[model samples]
Target: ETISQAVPPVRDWPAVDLPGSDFDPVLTELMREGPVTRISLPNGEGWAWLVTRHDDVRLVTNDPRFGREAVMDRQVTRLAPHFIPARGAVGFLDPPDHTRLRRSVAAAFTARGVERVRERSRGMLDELVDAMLRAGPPADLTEAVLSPFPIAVICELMGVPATDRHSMHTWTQLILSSSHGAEVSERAKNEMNAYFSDLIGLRSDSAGEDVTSLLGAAVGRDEITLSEAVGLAVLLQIGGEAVTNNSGQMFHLLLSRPELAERLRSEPEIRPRAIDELLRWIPHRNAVGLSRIALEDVEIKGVRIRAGDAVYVSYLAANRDPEVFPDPDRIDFERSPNPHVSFGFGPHYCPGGMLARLESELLVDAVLDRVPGLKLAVAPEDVPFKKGALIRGPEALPVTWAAA
Candidate 1:
């Protein structure tokens, strides 16, 4: 089918607008209706089937029949119109290609590799916390801590030069912001692509332990194409978004609950489980990361998804499915058997999951250890969130702590 004639025009699909960070009320209602239901894109571009149940969401993601390649070619059915679907991006590729790209970079994301980055990440977090303390209380945690920390870690990992790191962060901000306008997003995308092209060229001659250097080595040996290497570098660079957003949101969750924050500080042992619970609990985004088109006719929860039909698996809703977790709405740090797919599922599961967890753990631990009497500076309702963005988190986490 041609791009214009690909899918049917949206009709009768439920218009879902999650005004605030709280998504439980809307997602709970959807899950109660059925495991799979039709929903329109909030941007009014098109409609797709929304998968809410945990088991079903997992199944769709793992199953080969539901694919992403077709969606890349068709008109974007989401808010980010300038969202360029990179051909070599591992997230959009199917097996053979996806396997090869993932395999080439797999070693860097392994438990050992993630552990290697921890000490450095910890040092950075400490320095950031020190600066935040010096700046005084009632600061935006997102600005002072959450935002810069991950970017620094990612830049160090990717060997981004100190001079260029700020520009890289600014470009990334525009690309991720839905309200930034498409022209700005396009400009950012072009500038970033040009920047990576030059950086990759430099790494080709002299390589190092950084991700870009590793990807350059892969290109040198012909393990992956130059295009693939550039795409992978982009992926790793932008992956910081997950770490930053999740860390900010997780902190917001803990600080908003004085009892929970105190419990974590006192117990300490429960922080690991608490981190997992918060990852599962927070509505990371209103929709899935990428839309998948059914490669073949498939049945999900008695709903027949025809070939080429778009399917969005909601990790936000799936984690809160009542059938899977009792008291799904409440945060239970001690909750066992908590199999959350916040990082995603199957072959497309996040390669940076380990690093993200480590960064978050360190950030949370450092805050509770150093900052006394940490809490939100403003009312919970007053905190701003990025609306119409693919990833959802507080715009500025205005938080205050007792002075030392």
Candidate 2:
């Protein structure tokens, strides 16, 4: 009774001007359609497989049958026009090489490693909050507080200098936006690579706790090439700023729904769990992230994917799967055993997961406690969100607080 079926439906996933942590309707439709669907992004050459179900997302990411290295030299469909892979970049490297490069900086990302900067991070945060308050109310939180805290914290950990934080931010913004021409994005990326090259090269003889120092030692031992070290440094620096967008989304949700913010204010101890719930809920990115190539023929959810085929996984969809998290739409701070893959899963899981969680918790604690009456300055729908960018968040979170 079985009959041969044709190719799956190809969904066009475009970058729309979605507002304040709002999930993409297109992604929702794809999720409803099935677990494994075909999609063609705004840019790149052709269509790719996108896995939406929680279990399948985990399986595809964890399985060694699909590899990232094959993505090199391949123009698989992608979100941004300027996202061509650079040689020696860790994102495109497979295990053995990937493990070695990532392992070099592993010590800095450990709980203890991230903990070393805790007090200092808190101090930096306090100062930012203090300045925000001193300036008075009705301000753009994105510019005043949300943006600066992460830049400082990530730079501190990466061994980047405080004075150069401005330049780092400039480059990240340029590289992140597809609105900017590919030439401009490539130029910014090159500048950053050069800066890291000199910094890592200069630190070869040092023994500091920051990431560059550890990478410097590794490069000096010839354990990794200078290009690989620089590539990783650039990636970490750019990836670290993701907190700005994520936190923007979180703060928007809390302010729009005052009850959520008040719950954190009254039940301080539950803040961490609440942050997890929000992380699980936020639509962190506009569309599926970097695609992987299937090294061998494989079947995902009954769809046969040939060898060398490209596949993408939607973490946002996975976090919302009802099978994994019942009533996934409802914000339940008490949702126990929450296994959201917001930071992702598998070997390619974000290295800064711990650091990101620390920053989010600190933000929720500081803002909620300091601004007891914090609320949005305009109608919830009036808040502006970033557009034409891979990551989604408020461009400006107009907020005001009751003076103490």
Candidate 3:
């Protein structure tokens, strides 16, 4: 097999223009029809491949043959350079650099660290619910609870000031927006980097106890560089902000399915199992998958990918793979021995998975306990999903219910 005649590029490559709500359906179609689909970007950069099966995605994620750092070498023409920075601290780095930084940051996202955040996350849920009740009637659960709560938690955890929270959230949203235009996204990154640079300078000494503070200490002690610290901060800020929305959507999904909600209320022990299921079912950030470039000739799932080919592994497709997830469409509360890759697999598996799991479990439990009668203000079909090339969520989930 030659290079140009490789696997199909994900058709509708940039797929950013499609209705956001239709994404899951589109993905489902792609999964059933083919393993590797070609998608063409509107920009002259041409096509990239999207893999939509569980086994294929897992293989692609772990295969060092396909690497995230390939973008750095300019091996491929990217629609937006800011989308994958060549010399970033963590997410973009491969091998020794990525491994080294991840090892140090992994300490702050462990079971213990997640448990610590859980207590606070629960409190944050309670506060948000109180405000929701006081506000009364129909309200956008996303803005009131889902979106703001996680942003607040991440900011507090990273020692970001209260006033800056809104700005940071704005910047984060822009970066996450797929159709925000490359120019705007680049500008947002520059502004955000500038802000972090100032923060690094200000917290040079007398650092507080937070991720940012820890990074500062690391840099001062010759442990990491300013670039590494900035990258870590970027990851924490973006990754942390995502959890609240993910949890909120999980809650929305469960509440929509009264039977599941009732079962969860009755069998609280199933919460842990249900959390994993919810993570798979909600399809929050799963649509985007992880991007990898062929570092060398690689055969994945019987498809021969040549060096320099760009590939994406779709977790949404993987988690829904019938081979792995029995009756993949239905949510199973007692899904024992479930091994879904809602988090990416392999060397770059999400370090924040534990923290995210904690937040989702606690937030869902809180909603179930305190907002017992909560129900969506509108039908599920009526809710507006967020529009973007990546990232996923309801635009505004309105709900009405009596407080517990």
Taking all chains together, each candidate's TM-score versus the true structure is: 0.92, 0.97, 0.89
Clashes of 3: 11
lDDT of 1 by residue, 343-369 (tens): 899888889888888888898888899
Residue 231, model 1: Cα distance from true site in angstroms: 1.6
What lDDT tens digits, residue by residue, belong to model 3 across residues 1-404? 66554454455534443332234656666676578775554443645667878778777777667787765555342333356341575767777777777765677788887677677777877898788878775788788877877887778777788899998988877776653444577677777777776786575445666777777777787777888878768767877777755776676676667898888888878788888888877676624533678888776555777788888777777877888889887888777676888877877788888877877777777667777478888887677776554566777787877652
The candidate that achieves the highest TM-score relative to the unseen native structure: 2
Q: Candidate 2: minimum summed lDDT over ten consecutive residues — where? A: 177-186
The lDDT, on a scale of 0 to 1, for candidate 2 is: 0.87
Query: lDDT per prediction?
Result: 0.77, 0.87, 0.71
RMSD to the true structure for each prediction, in A, is: 4.4, 1.5, 3.2
lDDT of 1 at 77: 60
